[PDB]
Amino acid sequence: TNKPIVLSTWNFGLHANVEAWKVLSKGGKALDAVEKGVRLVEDDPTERSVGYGGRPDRDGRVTLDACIMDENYNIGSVACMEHIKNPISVARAVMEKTPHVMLVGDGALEFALSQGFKKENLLTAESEKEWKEWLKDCIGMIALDAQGNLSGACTTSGMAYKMHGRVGDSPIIGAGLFVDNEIGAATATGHGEEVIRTVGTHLVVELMNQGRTPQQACKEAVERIVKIVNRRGKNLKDIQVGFIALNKKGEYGAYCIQDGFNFAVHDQKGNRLETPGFALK
Amino acid sequence: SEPSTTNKPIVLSTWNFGLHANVEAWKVLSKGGKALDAVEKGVRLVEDDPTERSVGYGGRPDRDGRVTLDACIMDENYNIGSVACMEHIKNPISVARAVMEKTPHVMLVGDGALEFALSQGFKKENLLTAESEKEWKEWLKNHDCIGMIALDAQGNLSGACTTSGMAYKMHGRVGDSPIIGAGLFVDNEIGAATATGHGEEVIRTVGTHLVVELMNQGRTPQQACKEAVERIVKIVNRRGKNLKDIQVGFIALNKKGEYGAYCIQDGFNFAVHDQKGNRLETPGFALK
Ligand code: NA
Ligand code: NA
């Protein structure tokens, strides 16, 4: 087994991995590592697709989606939540502190406040400016820790200028994120509607369950999804879906419909940016 | 060549009230109509019924006395629509169908879902009946949803799921019913499945996507429902929980019109209407 190891999506995954590794390298829990990892990007107003600084919906409201899954089938999720900078941590509170696994809208905010989270104005001057001008994708992280336990976290401000109330894949278990401690974990990149449609990360993990490596599973999910896009009469150039994945042995994999995505991997070899295979050549 | 036997049209729905919801779906299916129209019409009957207290009008409120409704819908070509935690609209399944057909999104929640519904001509209505208000105030001091899946005369699958959610849930709580892959999943080249019960547990295990993938890899609909239930049973134990506290059922249909179901605990039936008639059937259960 190769452990610990953490993967996360996009260039900022490299920086998120560093924070995750501060936990993983000291023998801490995957759950804590992935929370710490993605909060880094939630916190950063120059990362405009996650948390603080996220581009608003078309009504100028910054609404955030996140979910988290630990090594023993515990889950939490918030969607379309406003004024709280660290939705992954509220999702973690939904998981640990309530008998529910998903809260949305005003109810998610009220819960957050009741747990001692603080309202903050998430719309930056920069985002407000660009929104008004307009009027005229996420971070996912999965890790295997020194105990051989998996966990993962996904957080986003969702599609810029979405309809108010729009929810993407990031807070939906089996779409944006899925973890089964006996199999593996996967988290998605791409058009949220399309990852929901195909239940993408549950598919990747079930393909690993069925005996595929993380790499084979990501590629086979994407190839199945490519055929569905065609069945739907759509142009593959208009659709992005991709996955990164980890199994219980610390093997990893990534594959997308289209070139141009990258993801960060940190293990005993250190932290680096790698690029997946892709279908649309 | 096509199958020697396909049982179509056919519609299945969860719980005893599925029997009369099936009659309404069959008005569409028996005339060669689309599975998508059939399953919408079928579940709207229950949404419309104030005496059905876990779906639509008359649904028991969250703990603050808001009736907030969840539904999703899926047709024969991976088109999907979903609303969740939506207030004041009696037929969330039809707003879900509008999300699917009329927007570039697949899920709206909360205020945004209501504003969209109003923009589409749905009418704001008071969904809290005197009876539900009475019970709620007192509280202060089975049939948890309807899922319906159908195979029409063309050989196409579609499904719908709609609920008012756990009674006296936290404000904003969403269960499995509006989540594609949890409460409902339909793939026209394999089969369809819809779920009922403790929504948290169906979300946890991505239940209907799992049932349909098990059919994909060769299980019959009943085999796939049963194996999914038994996975939930294993997970409940891994989590150190007591199975007695949990109910989940699945019903499932494949491309040939074969069907099946299975649940954790007894007392769950489903209704199936095909050309031979409308039947209330009782599946096996895990907790014996
Ligand atoms: Na940010
Ligand atoms: Na009702």
Distance CA A172, CA B82 (A): 12
B116–A80 C-beta distance less than 8 A: no
Alpha helices of chain A — where are they, by DSSP H? 12-24, 30-43, 87-97, 105-114, 125-135, 192-197, 200-209, 214-231
Which residue in the set A164, A178, A232 is minimally distant from B77, CB to CB?
Answer: A232
- Token pair, residue B58, equals 């008359």
A74–B169 C-beta distance less than 8 A: no
Distance CA A111, CA A85 (A): 14
Torsion-angle region of A158 (φ positive above 0: left; ψ -120 to 50: alpha; else: beta): left
Distance CA B58, CA B46 (A): 10
DSSP state of B61: P
Q: Are B180 and A197 in contact (CB under 8 A)?
A: yes
DSSP state of B76: T
Q: Are A9 and A139 in contact (CB under 8 A)?
A: yes
Distance CA B177, CA B183 (A): 4
Which residue in the set A166, A172, A193 is minimally distant from B179, CB to CB?
Answer: A172
B167 interaction partners in chain A (CB closer than 8 Å): none
Distance CA A13, CA A135 (A): 31
* Resolution attained, angstroms: 1.9
B62 interaction partners in chain A (CB closer than 8 Å): 107
- Residue B207 near chain A (CB below 8 Å): no
Count of other CB atoms within 10 angstroms of residue A274? 12
β partners of residue A67: A77, A154
- Residue A99 near chain B (CB below 8 Å): yes
Q: Are A115 and A3 in contact (CB under 8 A)?
A: no
Q: How far apart are the first and last CA of chain A?
A: 33
CB-side exposure of A35: number of CA atoms within 13 Å?
20
- Residue B112 near chain A (CB below 8 Å): yes
CA B86, A57, A255: angle at the middle one, nearest 5? 95
Q: Which residues surround ligand 1, an ion (CB under 5 A)?
A: A 44, 47, 50-53
Pick the closest to residue A52 from A130, A125, A131, A152 (CA basis).
A125
Mutation target vs A (from B64, B77, B89, B105; most A CBs, 10 A cutoff)? B105
For residue B272, what are the domain limits?
1-288
Method used experimentally: X-ray
Q: How many helices (H) and strands (E) does chain B have?
A: 8, 13
Distance CA A16, CA A189 (A): 16
Sheet strands side by side (includes B248-254): B184-187, B191-197, B248-254, B259-263, B284-285
DSSP track, A178-228: EEETTTEEEEEEE-HHHHHHTTHHHHHHHHHHTT--HHHHHHHHHHHHHHH
Contacts of A281 (CB under 8 A, 6+ apart): none
Contacts of A64 (CB under 8 A, 6+ apart): A51, A54, A78, A80, A81, A82, A84, A87, A122, A155, A156, A157, A158
Go through chain B and list every residue after which a break occurs, taking a C to next N gap over 2.5 angstroms, comma-separated: 141
Closest residue in chain B to residue A69, using alpha carbons only:
B204
Does residue B209 sit in helix, strand or coil? helix
Q: Are A188 and A177 in contact (CB under 8 A)?
A: yes
Number of domains within chain A: 1
Residue with tokens 């293990």: A267
- Token pair, residue B287, equals 């907790």
Q: Are B127 and B69 in contact (CB under 8 A)?
A: yes
Count of other CB atoms within 10 angstroms of residue B218? 8
Q: Alpha carbon of A75 to those of A130, B108, B218, B276: distances in Å?
A: 35, 21, 30, 43
DSSP track, A50-80: SSTTPPP-TTS---EEEEEE-TTS-EEEEEE
Q: Are B22 and B11 in contact (CB under 8 A)?
A: yes
Distance A197 CA to ligand 1 centre (A): 26
- Element holding A271 (H helix, E strand): strand A270-274
Alpha helices of chain B — where are they, by DSSP H? 18-29, 35-47, 92-102, 110-119, 130-140, 199-204, 207-216, 221-238
Pick the closest to residue B72 from B167, B233, B202, B169 (CA basis).
B202
- Token pair, residue A35, equals 């929370």
